[model samples]
Every structure is written in structure tokens, then in C-alpha cells.
Target: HHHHHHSHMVGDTVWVRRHQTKNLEPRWKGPYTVLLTTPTALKVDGIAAWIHAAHVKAADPGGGPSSRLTWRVQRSQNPLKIRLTREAP
Candidate 1:
């Protein structure tokens, strides 16, 4: 069965699914900014890449490094690097 979801607008920060087969710990990635939007997919600001609509989700408004110790973040402009980090317990 196909599920219908994932709608986004330009400048919205969202989560994109990672297409890998190994080490499946976190299922989603981002805080990626939506640059271009179509009915079937989204082109985010990070790395100038397009992600499928089925794999996009809105990012938490209050979510950030200061709020949460562990997170995946990338710059909305240039040098799009996905930084993954965790805080000491």
C-alpha cells in the first residue's frame, strides 16, 4: 500500500531519508532547507540535492544543538555539511 504524505514549502526545514543499506540507526536525516518544491519531490538547499516527497518531513521548530545534545544539522547556504554530534552524559 502506498501512503500519501510529505508536503513542504520553500524555505522550510525538513528531514530527508538516507538511502543506505548498512548501519541503520537513525532512519531520517536533515534539518534540510526546502529550496524547490514539486508534487513528487523536493530540492533542498543542502548540497543542491533533490529528495523524494515520501521521505520529507517538517523539522521541529525548537529543535537545535543547544536544545538537544544529539542532532544532524546542515547549513542552509554554502558548504552543506551534515554534522552529527552527541553530548557527554
Candidate 2:
């Protein structure tokens, strides 16, 4: 499941690395300030389910075929993929 935390403070700066279609082009580099923070959580879908902060494959910038993906929910700004007693990967 995709477990994550919210962006604690509004207007907090965050980074989002978005990869585009065809040749795996990464098309992003910005300090997207936090729009808002809200209690948020969801489930992952796929053989390799989606998990915040989970490593994902990105074929751009010649940084190999994969990289880790970090995400922030809508409520608190913190590492959400952090394994807790309830769930550990």
C-alpha cells in the first residue's frame, strides 16, 4: 500500500520529479510550495505496488534505469515511506 505523510506546513517548498512519455524524459525541477496540508493516505496498485519514498525506475539524465521516489501527502511534511511497527518492508 502507498503510505505517506502530509505536508505539515503550508507554503513549504517541495520538489517533484516528473518523467514524461517516450524515451523516459524527466520534465520537472521546481520548488512547488505546499498548496495545503490534509490527512491523506491511500493504497498502491500493481505487482510492485506504489509506496511513497519507494524506489522507482527513471530512465533519464543517464542516472541508471531506476531511482527512489519520495512523496509528501497533504497534511504533514515528513518521510512517509518510513517503516513503522504497523508495517515494515
Candidate 3:
């Protein structure tokens, strides 16, 4: 028997290619969590559909924690104000 497989694994975070179209667009759409795996596709968390293995690639593990947004609050005003910032990787 013959078999085929790619590098992704269950529980790995990955980026998936957005839908293909005639026009150009951003190459990938996700930082989605991988929930399950099969020879042909992946079941990503939150998406209503499963995507083909050719459409997904493993995410950079190093940036997973530090790349998130950080927030700051200002207390000088009567109403509270919030500021969002990006954390360096």
C-alpha cells in the first residue's frame, strides 16, 4: 500500500491558507489550534469546516506566547480608558 503525509501534528498551532481566488490576497488566514488530524486534512479549533493538509502549515513555536497583545489602563480620567499594545516576540 502507498501512503502520504505532511508535517503537521495534532495540538500544534498552525496557519492555514485563505480561500483561493483569481485575485491576490494574504497567503494565510490563521493562528488556529489543531484539534485532530487525518491523512488528507486537519480539524482546526473554531472553524466550522476542516481544511486540507496542503492548506495548513505549522506555526512558529517560539513566538506563541510573546507575540500576544498587552493592555494598559489609564486612571486619570473620570471614565476608565484602555490602551492595547503588541508585546515584542
TM-score for each of the candidates = 0.48, 0.30, 0.51
The candidate 3 region of ten consecutive residues with least summed lDDT is 67-76
**Model 1: how far residue 2 lies from native, Å:** 34
Q: Which pairs in model 1 have colliding backbones?
A: none
Q: State, as a TM-score between 0 and 1, how close model 3 is to the true structure.
A: 0.51
Candidate 2, superposed: residue stretches over 4 Å from native: 1-7, 23-27, 38-89
**Model 1: CA > 4 A from native:** 1-9, 23-26, 63-89
Span of ten consecutive residues with least summed lDDT in model 2: 58-67
Off by over 4 Å in 3: 1-10, 23-26, 63-89
> Whole-model lDDT for model 3 versus the true structure?
0.53
lDDT of each: 0.53, 0.32, 0.53
**lDDT per residue as tens, model 3, 1-89:** 32323423334556787766869764886567665566678767676768787887766545435223212122122332212323324
Q: Which digits, one per residue and each the tens of the lDDT, describe model 1 over residues 1-89?
A: 42223333344556776656686653678666665566677867665567777777656535554223322242233433233333223
CA RMSD of each candidate after superposition: 11.7, 13.0, 15.4
lDDT score of residue 55 within candidate 2 = 23
User: Candidate 1, TM-score vs. the true structure?
Assistant: 0.48
